[PDB]
């Protein structure tokens, strides 16, 4: 029997990317128009791409123009979707279909389809930082040496700036590269060294800028 | 440049009946018409093309007509199997445009909902996410609303729902909405509702719990 | 002048499926072998794939082999690599190559690189569920709270299968977190609540977890 | 299967310095080999190309050099902008295999870290996770080795590490390694603690805290 099937989806902020490919079985794409189509929330269908036999022409609905991409690959039997600047209202199971039938002609219908894969968007585009302290050790060595700082936990997307008292701290201070968490959000950690005879009389604060959220946070850092 | 446009969006019958689902272009595009049936999770299914010719192995007791803008597919003999969604298409040499298609139910009495509200498990809670659970048991038709309400105030985006498929011995639907917080904006307010519209309510019907209690 | 920008990189968890593209700037793709490099996190390169022109040539690295699958676009300028199965060892930055020389010939080096895209396959392949309990109210209806799994499905029954009538079992939901989540519920007598026990068996089959949670009243 | 080995795998240098990175190939591919470089999170940039062969626009104090097995990447008078790794290449029409790469640094005196140890903080543990971050301060050369230990007990899994460029004015690296639990698994234990080995050190240093002090 013929089939088709998607791969690739899954969830994407908004605004992000994502690219979908679709292969088949017991037929040659080649002879074939291919075309992709998504079912809404609402149940409706909405066509959203085509594609004609050897690529002469590349046909888009008017909600996905300039931002969806068709190609075909005739050789090994794929068809692939790049979905770009991605919208909430692209959410949908997405369909790889073949127009088609028992003989082939200028103008047939959709004769097989694939099963679906699942494609959400969420409507954050982007989340602040939440700012913890790094509280320096109570049992420092008494005379100097002491370690605090800042962690940027849960951000997105990069990047994040940060300076110490508005930019008046500079010797000793380490901005770390932030690491990928598995939530898919960003973390990274600031930290300086300081006397630790200074603690008690120097007030220090970490100034966090996330300016793809537009969010400022100054956090004031203290023993204990 | 062609909008097509079906009627009714639900169509409500009992097996055995003979129904007719319409479909309208904006402009005339011939017999350049497909019918496709389609069950929830599952891929469409191709019936009919050129406007009335039947795709080898559908069932006879499909049959399309039309042309010009008006257009129709006829089911002599809805059996169970038949009910779904099923949509028109107008189909060109490149792209192509569909309805918003026609869901097919079966025919029963309206029922109202049995509403129930859940708070969040103690558990849940002390790992920092709150999610409460409103159910809507056995109600007829599909069509429903939920609303949050949190010390009444409107709730939106942080909410999800799913809805049953008719149940086979009394053919009604059952729905289940999340509405999901952290524990940090869960513990500042204390009235958690839910509110209910449905065709078998003469008004609407809400659930409450007071958090804590 | 020339430049290469690749798109869809992201988190996939192991055994999934993730697709990358590559688009240019200020040249043709048609007249090169197009490449994908990856950078592993202990800072080597590793050579992945390689599509020569008219894709007479599709050549894989021994280690993705039978995985991934690299095609090209030569009218819109595009290159493409299908990541399947995927593994831990697959995470690297993904980097699209052209291989050219101001004169091309045979076999000219890898003259034009993108900036890449960073790709990062968790350990985990799947994830046994939380099962928190939907406490009937002080026919009363409980239920299961069956929460963050994956994959799907699981199965739900009630008292060992002993207990049918007026059960209900959700379609999951895929929350943001990427995990799935549903709740079963079943109505009952108002009177049994303190007389009949009732436990969801909760089994997750590509976890190979199972778990049994008691409801009761409060 | 071709298989490229580079020699050394770190190369530390002065600025000015006239060093070699060499390739060596399993068996003979003539002169098809080409060198890049490469800066940390930028792409990178082809330098040589048939084994001796200069791209337009690279500078002259690059040369390459080697045929058959044994190839050499020569740099005549480092400048601060080469500091980088660099990766030889066996390219074939269809395929390609790189070595290990060699990075490049700049040459100082023994440091080793200054360690400190940092709890988690009471407003993020109310919220459910437990990050514990260790910091390695001022050390050289870059390689150093982080293991936590809950109740000494080896952890395995549960921290990431990221490293600093080279610092402008002495030179040295910094590392932090943070340690992420749940409010739950950081609470069922008492003792925790980084050990941090490093040439610098005689004996592995052991920074830790008790849970509330």
New interface residues.
């Given amino acids: 029997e013929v089939q088709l099937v998607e791969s690739g989806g899954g969830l994407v902020k908004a605004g992000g990317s994502l690219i979908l490919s679709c292969g088949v079985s017991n037929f040659r794409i080649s002879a074939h128009?291919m075309?992709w189509?998504r079912?809404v929330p609402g149940?409706?269908?909405?066509?959203v791409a085509?594609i004609?036999t050897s690529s002469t022409?590349r046909?888009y609905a008017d909600a996905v123009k300039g931002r969806f991409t068709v190609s075909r690959d005739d050789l090994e039997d794929f068809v692939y979707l790049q979905m770009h600047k991605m919208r909430v209202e692209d959410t949908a199971i997405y369909?790889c279909?073949r127009?088609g039938?028992?003989r082939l002609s200028?103008?047939?219908?959709?004769?097989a389809?694939?099963?679906?894969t699942v494609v959400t968007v969420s409507?954050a585009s982007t989340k602040g930082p939440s700012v913890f302290p790094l509280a320096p050790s109570s049992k420092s060595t008494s005379g100097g040496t002491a370690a605090l700082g800042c962690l940027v936990k849960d951000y997105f997307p990069e990047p994040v700036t940060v300076s110490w008292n508005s930019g008046a701290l500079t010797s000793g201070v380490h901005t770390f590269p932030a690491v990928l968490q598995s939530s898919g959000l960003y973390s990274l950690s600031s930290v300086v060294t300081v006397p630790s005879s200074s603690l008690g009389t120097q007030t220090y604060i970490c100034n966090v800028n996330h300016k793809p959220s537009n969010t400022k946070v100054d956090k004031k850092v203290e023993p204990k | 440049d062609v909008v097509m446009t079906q009627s009714p969006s639900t169509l409500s019958a009992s097996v055995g009946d003979t129904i007719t689902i319409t479909c309208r272009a904006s402009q005339s595009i011939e017999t350049?018409l497909?019918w496709?049936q389609?069950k929830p999770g599952?891929?469409?299914?191709?019936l009919i093309?050129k406007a009335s010719t039947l795709?080898?192995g559908v069932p006879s007791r499909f049959s399309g007509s039309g042309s010009g803008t008006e257009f129709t597919l006829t089911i002599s003999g809805l059996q169970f199997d038949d009910f779904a969604?099923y949509?028109c298409?107008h189909?060109?040499?490149?792209?192509?445009?569909?309805?918003?298609?026609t869901?097919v139910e079966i025919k029963r009495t309206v029922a109202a909902p049995?509403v129930?509200?859940?708070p969040?498990?103690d558990?849940?809670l002390?790992?920092?996410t709150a999610?409460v659970?409103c159910?809507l048991?056995n109600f007829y038709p599909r069509e429903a609303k939920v609303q949050w309400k949190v010390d009444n105030a409107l709730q939106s985006?942080n909410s999800?729902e799913?809805v049953?498929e008719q149940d086979s011995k009394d053919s009604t639907y059952?729905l289940?909405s999340?509405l999901?917080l952290?524990?940090?904006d869960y513990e500042k307010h204390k009235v958690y509702a839910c509110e209910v519209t449905h065709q078998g309510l003469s008004s609407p019907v809400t659930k409450s719990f007071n958090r804590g209690e």
């Fill in positions: 128009t075309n189509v079912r149940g409706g269908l909405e066509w085509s004609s022409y046909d369909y279909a127009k039938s028992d200028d103008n047939d219908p959709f004769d389809w694939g099963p679906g409507p | 350049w497909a496709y389609q599952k891929a469409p299914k191709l093309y795709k080898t969604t949509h298409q189909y060109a040499g490149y792209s192509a445009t569909f309805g918003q298609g869901r049995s129930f509200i859940f969040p498990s558990e849940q002390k790992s920092g999610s659970v159910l048991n985006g999800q799913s049953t059952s289940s999340t999901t952290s524990k940090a």
